[PDB]
C-alpha cells in the first residue's frame, strides 16, 4: 500500500449512553387532633401512634 497512508487519519470511536433525570417521589400523611381522640382511649398510646 502507498506511502501517503501515513497522512490518513483514524479517530477512536465512541460508545456512549445517556440517562437523564430520575424521579422525585413524595409521600404525605395527615394526623388529626379530634377524630383520632374519639378512638385511642389513652393519650400515651396516641403519642406512640404519632411516632
Amino acid at each position: 500500500k502507498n506511502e501517503e497512508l501515513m497522512l490518513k487519519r483514524n479517530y477512536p470511536r465512541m460508545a456512549t449512553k445517556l440517562y437523564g433525570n430520575g424521579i422525585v417521589k413524595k409521600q404525605k400523611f395527615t394526623l388529626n387532633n379530634n377524630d383520632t381522640r374519639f378512638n385511642f382511649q389513652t393519650l400515651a398510646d396516641a403519642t406512640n401512634y404519632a411516632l
Binding site: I23, K25, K26, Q27
Partner: protein
C-alpha cells in the same frame, strides 16, 4: 401367730413437674375485660406529577 404385722417404711415417691414455656411469663394487674392492639396499613410512595 399372734404378733401384729410390723410395717416399717412409707416413702411418698414424688417429683415436681415443669412448663417448657415459662419464658413467656407475663404478669399483669387483672383489670379490664377486653384488650387489643393495632398496626398501620402501608402507604406506598407516589409519582410527583407536579402539573
Amino acid at each position: 401367730k399372734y404378733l401384729f404385722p410390723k410395717i416399717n417404711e412409707t416413702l411418698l415417691i414424688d417429683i415436681a413437674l415443669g412448663n417448657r414455656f415459662n419464658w413467656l411469663a407475663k404478669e399483669q394487674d387483672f383489670i379490664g375485660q377486653y384488650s387489643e392492639e393495632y398496626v398501620i396499613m402501608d402507604t406506598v410512595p407516589i409519582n410527583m406529577d407536579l402539573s
